[model samples]
Target: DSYARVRAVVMTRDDSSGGWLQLGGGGLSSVTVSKTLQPGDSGGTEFLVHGERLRDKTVILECVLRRDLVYNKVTPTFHHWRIGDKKFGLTFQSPADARAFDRGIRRAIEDLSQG
Candidate 1:
């Protein structure tokens, strides 16, 4: 699922060994999402356009584990995950936008894992 320039906030974790329960600076930004793969590769890489600060960063969808993804449909907050040692939290302007990205990430992980 590819989306262009969606409103969001990129957050970071302050301390270790806790849930994303602690974070700082929920600053607003826009994110663009896309997926790509090399020739003869079974799995693809999904990437982001992060407000031009970190332009074109690849989040290798193949590396995303199912249990690591955190989303709350009932509570309806940000999309949180850890890629490598970096914990990322992305919050959208609206719940619907957040929900859509949540589903997209889940499906992308499933598609790669079901291989």
Candidate 2:
């Protein structure tokens, strides 16, 4: 079995910011995104490398982070905002990582298991 840090690049619900709670997007800010994004959510990471935009390839010390995982709308556990033929922000990753993240974020799912 193999596992590692599941990082990704995500956008706000409407490309806006979350204000406080560190969910908002900063102008030209780069971070290691680990949570979902919303229009005004400010806690989402921006996925950066070397204080620069991250990419698929690692170029010496120039590239900050090398990532291959991007959030997929229809992921293993994440449920996106959808209406008819519309879908909202979505990121996809490995099953274990994806499902685990959902369990921590999607409160609705957790509520079901509440005692």
Best by TM-score: 1
- Measured against the true structure, the TM-scores of the candidates, in listed sequence, are 0.55, 0.27
What is the per-residue lDDT of model 2 for residues 1-115, given as tens digits with 9 covering 90 to 100? 1112233333234434521211123222232222222213433222222222235332211111112222244556332432333323323345676565444334322222211
Q: After superposition, how far is residue 50 of candidate 1 from its true place, in Å?
A: 5.4
Global CA lDDT computed for model 1? 0.50
- lDDT, candidates in the order shown: 0.50, 0.31
Candidate 1 lDDT, tens digit per residue, 9-109?
66556566554532233445555443433313545443332432233333212223343445434346566666677666666678787777666666654
Off by over 4 Å in 2: 1-6, 11-73, 82-87, 107-115
- Whole-model lDDT, candidate 2? 0.31
> Which sections of candidate 1 miss by over 4 Å?
1-5, 16-26, 37-40, 43-74, 113-115
Local error of candidate 1 at residue 111 (angstroms): 3.0
